[PDB]
């Protein structure tokens, strides 16, 4: 009656039909590290981080978008799973600029946490390191677009929650500028909610910009006002 058997490193668990490897792996507690997938939006696959060596397959496959055949066994802690994570995490930090002081996501990066906890240490890629000059999206949202890892999270958020359709991919190869082509200051509702979407320090708050870095500030539960929903 609508079950799927998987072994997560031996520990069996049961999966609803049609779902992902990732929701069951998050069902047993193992958060596979992710960048493009986020549960309020659709599924891109363009961050490629969620590779996991799923057995009897020479090709290591993504886990945010794999249909779950009956009777898997999902090797998370293998050798070449770690080697694929080493490779991908080394690839992200090539054309990313040395901004972790003047980045506004020092306590709250994602490259920083996941590249400590999963990546290499000795870098390579000795020369190069191109840079994309920023835009002027809206005076409430400060915007640096060299740090954009082109992860297509703001784009899907626009076209699938905002419905505004003002952010687009432009270009090919390395050169993918992400934004609005026509010097238009993008202003719409919920554009304040895009600085919480952008996982890396490329879309920050403009008025908050440079007053604190978030280990100092303590976090407290409260209830909203000004809307009747809270």
């Amino acid at each position: 009656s609508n079950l799927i058997e998987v072994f997560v490193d031996g520990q069996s668990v049961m999966v609803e039909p049609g779902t992902t490897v990732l929701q069951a792996c998050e069902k047993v507690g193992m958060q596979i590290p992710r960048f493009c997938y986020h549960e309020r939006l659709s599924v891109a696959g363009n961050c490629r981080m969620c590779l996991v060596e799923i057995e009897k397959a020479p090709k290591v496959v993504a886990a945010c978008a794999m249909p779950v055949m009956k009777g898997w066994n999902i090797l998370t802690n293998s050798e070449k799973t770690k080697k694929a994570r080493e490779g991908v995490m080394e690839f992200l930090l090539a054309n990313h600029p040395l901004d972790c002081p003047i980045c506004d996501q020092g306590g709250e990066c994602d490259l920083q946490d996941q590249s400590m906890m999963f990546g290499s240490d000795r870098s390579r890629f000795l020369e190069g390191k191109r840079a994309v000059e920023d835009k002027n999206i809206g005076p409430l949202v400060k915007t640096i677009m060299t740090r954009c890892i082109q992860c297509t999270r703001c784009i899907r958020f626009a076209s699938e929650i905002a419905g505004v359709d003002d952010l687009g991919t432009t270009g090919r190869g390395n050169d993918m500028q992400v934004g609005t082509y026509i010097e238009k200051m993008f202003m719409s509702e919920l554009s304040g909610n895009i600085i919480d979407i952008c996982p890396v320090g490329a879309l920050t708050s403009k008025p908050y910009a440079f007053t604190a870095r978030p280990w100092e500030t303590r976090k407290t539960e409260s209830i909203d006002v000004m809307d009747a929903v809270g």
């Binding site: 003002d166 952010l167 687009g168 432009t170 934004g179 082509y181 026509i182 010097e183």
Partner: protein
């Protein structure tokens, strides 16, 4: 090469831009080919009509195409920034693509690049202080089986040498245009020895087949 618009009028919507009702009939043929429910699939042929009509597309062309196909313009800006055949810079009458990658570069396109350069004067990748000589070198096109190649406005030139460069470019100055096909004889992609292909007039349906 500057993938953000930054108006610079002779752009700056509205630049006044409109087609011909004959081209509107082309438009309705194009978005009546594709199935209903997915009107947004004919964006690239409509934009091709806009380029073939007016040699390069301004931004008001993109607003026009967006309102014709009743889409947000952002998809049109993506498809305009994404491909190769659409040049957002204004160009001249004739456009030059000097194609050179793998057999084309090793069969000495650098001689042809020198010939084009020291005949024309304007440097590679750039434009010209007249019309009809927007020169860019390009990557592979497909027609590789000869000398490195030239594409001008929907035509080819293969089997080159700088005297043919002088001739063809003087004639595009004059207005007269030679053939898309090959040179040095050998009227197609031919085995250029002693015709090692088939020779007999082929039989076809006449001889031994089975179940039909």
């Amino acid at each position: 090469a500057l993938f953000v618009h930054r108006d610079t009028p002779k752009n700056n919507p509205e630049t006044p831009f409109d087609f011909t009702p004959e081209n509107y009939k082309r438009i309705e043929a194009i978005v009546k080919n594709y199935p209903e429910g997915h009107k947004a699939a004919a964006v690239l042929p409509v934009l091709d009509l806009a380029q073939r009509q007016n040699g390069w597309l301004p931004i008001s062309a993109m607003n026009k195409v967006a309102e014709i196909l009743q889409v947000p313009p952002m998809r049109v800006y993506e498809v305009a920034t994404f491909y190769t055949m659409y040049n957002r810079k204004p160009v001249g009458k004739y456009h030059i693509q000097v194609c050179t990658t793998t057999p084309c570069m090793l069969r000495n396109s650098d001689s042809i690049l020198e010939a084009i350069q020291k005949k024309l004067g304007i440097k590679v990748g750039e434009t010209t202080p007249d019309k009809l000589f927007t020169l860019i070198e390009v990557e592979c096109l497909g027609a590789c089986v000869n000398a490195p190649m030239v594409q001008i406005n929907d035509n080819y030139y293969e089997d080159l040498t700088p005297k043919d460069i002088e001739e063809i470019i003087d004639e595009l100055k004059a207005g007269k245009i030679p053939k898309p096909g090959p040179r040095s004889g050998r009227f197609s992609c031919e085995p250029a020895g002693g015709l090692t292909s088939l020779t007999e007039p082929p039989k076809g349906p006449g001889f031994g087949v089975q179940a039909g």
